[PDB]
Design an enzyme around this catalytic site. Structure first.
Site, PDB file in Angstrom:
ATOM      1  N   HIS A   1       0.828  -1.194   0.000  1.00  0.00           N
ATOM      2  CA  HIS A   1       0.000   0.000   0.000  1.00  0.00           C
ATOM      3  C   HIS A   1       0.867   1.251   0.000  1.00  0.00           C
ATOM      4  O   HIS A   1       2.086   1.211   0.218  1.00  0.00           O
ATOM      5  CB  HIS A   1      -0.999  -0.044   1.172  1.00  0.00           C
ATOM      6  CG  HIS A   1      -0.427   0.351   2.499  1.00  0.00           C
ATOM      7  ND1 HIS A   1      -1.100   1.161   3.387  1.00  0.00           N
ATOM      8  CD2 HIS A   1       0.772   0.081   3.070  1.00  0.00           C
ATOM      9  CE1 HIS A   1      -0.368   1.318   4.477  1.00  0.00           C
ATOM     10  NE2 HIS A   1       0.793   0.709   4.291  1.00  0.00           N
TER      11      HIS A   1
ATOM     12  N   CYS B   1       3.713   5.393   5.506  1.00  0.00           N
ATOM     13  CA  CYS B   1       3.924   4.188   6.299  1.00  0.00           C
ATOM     14  C   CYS B   1       5.394   3.784   6.251  1.00  0.00           C
ATOM     15  O   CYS B   1       6.066   3.993   5.245  1.00  0.00           O
ATOM     16  CB  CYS B   1       3.043   3.050   5.763  1.00  0.00           C
ATOM     17  SG  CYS B   1       2.979   1.519   6.735  1.00  0.00           S
TER      18      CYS B   1
ATOM     19  N   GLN C   1      -7.173  -2.951   9.699  1.00  0.00           N
ATOM     20  CA  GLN C   1      -8.357  -2.127   9.876  1.00  0.00           C
ATOM     21  C   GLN C   1      -9.402  -2.569   8.864  1.00  0.00           C
ATOM     22  O   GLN C   1      -9.074  -2.968   7.741  1.00  0.00           O
ATOM     23  CB  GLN C   1      -7.997  -0.660   9.691  1.00  0.00           C
ATOM     24  CG  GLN C   1      -6.896  -0.220  10.635  1.00  0.00           C
ATOM     25  CD  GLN C   1      -6.616   1.260  10.560  1.00  0.00           C
ATOM     26  OE1 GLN C   1      -7.376   2.083  11.070  1.00  0.00           O
ATOM     27  NE2 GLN C   1      -5.552   1.614   9.857  1.00  0.00           N
TER      28      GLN C   1
ATOM     29  N   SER D   1      -5.985   5.515   9.700  1.00  0.00           N
ATOM     30  CA  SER D   1      -4.606   5.925   9.472  1.00  0.00           C
ATOM     31  C   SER D   1      -4.503   7.045   8.454  1.00  0.00           C
ATOM     32  O   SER D   1      -3.565   7.846   8.528  1.00  0.00           O
ATOM     33  CB  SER D   1      -3.749   4.743   9.000  1.00  0.00           C
ATOM     34  OG  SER D   1      -4.048   3.571   9.730  1.00  0.00           O
TER      35      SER D   1
ATOM     36  N   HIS E   1      -5.419   5.225   1.618  1.00  0.00           N
ATOM     37  CA  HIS E   1      -4.531   4.239   1.006  1.00  0.00           C
ATOM     38  C   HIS E   1      -4.841   3.987  -0.465  1.00  0.00           C
ATOM     39  O   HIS E   1      -5.993   4.066  -0.908  1.00  0.00           O
ATOM     40  CB  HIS E   1      -4.606   2.875   1.690  1.00  0.00           C
ATOM     41  CG  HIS E   1      -4.629   2.928   3.178  1.00  0.00           C
ATOM     42  ND1 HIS E   1      -3.629   2.367   3.942  1.00  0.00           N
ATOM     43  CD2 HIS E   1      -5.564   3.381   4.047  1.00  0.00           C
ATOM     44  CE1 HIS E   1      -3.929   2.511   5.224  1.00  0.00           C
ATOM     45  NE2 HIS E   1      -5.097   3.126   5.314  1.00  0.00           N
TER      46      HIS E   1
HETATM   47  O1  LIG Z   1       3.585  -0.873   9.349  1.00  0.00           O
HETATM   48  C1  LIG Z   1       3.670  -2.285   9.215  1.00  0.00           C
HETATM   49  C2  LIG Z   1       4.878  -2.666   8.404  1.00  0.00           C
HETATM   50  C3  LIG Z   1       4.833  -3.812   7.581  1.00  0.00           C
HETATM   51  C4  LIG Z   1       5.912  -4.172   6.832  1.00  0.00           C
HETATM   52  C5  LIG Z   1       7.094  -3.406   6.874  1.00  0.00           C
HETATM   53  N1  LIG Z   1       8.158  -3.798   6.114  1.00  0.00           N
HETATM   54  C6  LIG Z   1       9.249  -3.059   6.173  1.00  0.00           C
HETATM   55  C7  LIG Z   1       9.397  -1.905   6.960  1.00  0.00           C
HETATM   56  C8  LIG Z   1       8.347  -1.506   7.719  1.00  0.00           C
HETATM   57  C9  LIG Z   1       7.152  -2.261   7.688  1.00  0.00           C
HETATM   58  C10 LIG Z   1       6.016  -1.913   8.452  1.00  0.00           C
END
Ligand SMILES: OCc1ccc2ncccc2c1
Length: 145
Positions: A41, A95, A113, A136, A139
């Site tokens: 995402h 993210c 979610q 959040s 997306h």
């Molecule tokens: O936020 C959840 C999530 C999932 C996967 C991830 N992979 C790499 C770095 C951070 C990451 C964070």
């Protein structure tokens, strides 16, 4: 038609298209459940996000409307091929999964979610969502498995 699709009419061209009210995808072609799916995402946060901060900005101040405009612009460039989803996620996703080109790995129902989960499980493998809203932020979701 598959889960969550409906016919609609283009306001500008008059031509029929199809719209999914679970994923917010839209397309011109007529479209044609597993324990787990794998998605990536691209998140754009806004000032009412549950945590309005990210690796990109200590204080995220953009409005929800502004975040939606950014999301819409990213979708446009992805669909035109000017940019790749993975490229935009790495650069602009709020993210931490940005560092993995947006990949979240595989997940079951109950873990994400609910609006995210429903869009993820309604996408076909390889499909992209439209804008999906959660606490959040907003997306773009790409189902990869
Ligand atoms: O936020 C959840 C999530 C999932 C996967 C991830 N992979 C790499 C770095 C951070 C990451 C964070």
């Amino acid at each position: 038609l598959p889960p969550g699709w409906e016919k609609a009419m283009s306001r500008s061209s008059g031509r029929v298209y199809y719209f999914n009210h679970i994923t917010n995808a839209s397309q011109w072609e007529r479209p044609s459940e597993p324990a787990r799916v794998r998605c990536s995402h691209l998140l754009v946060k806004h000032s009412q996000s549950r945590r309005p901060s990210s690796w990109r900005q200590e204080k995220i101040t953009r409005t929800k409307e502004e975040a939606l405009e950014l999301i819409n612009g990213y979708i446009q460039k992805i669909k035109s091929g000017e940019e790749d989803f993975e490229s935009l996620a790495s650069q602009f996703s709020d993210c931490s999964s940005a560092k993995a080109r947006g990949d979240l790995g595989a997940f079951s129902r109950g873990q994400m979610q609910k609006p995210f989960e429903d869009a993820s499980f309604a996408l076909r493998t390889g499909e992209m969502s439209g804008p999906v809203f959660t606490d959040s932020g907003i997306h773009i979701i790409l189902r990869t498995e």
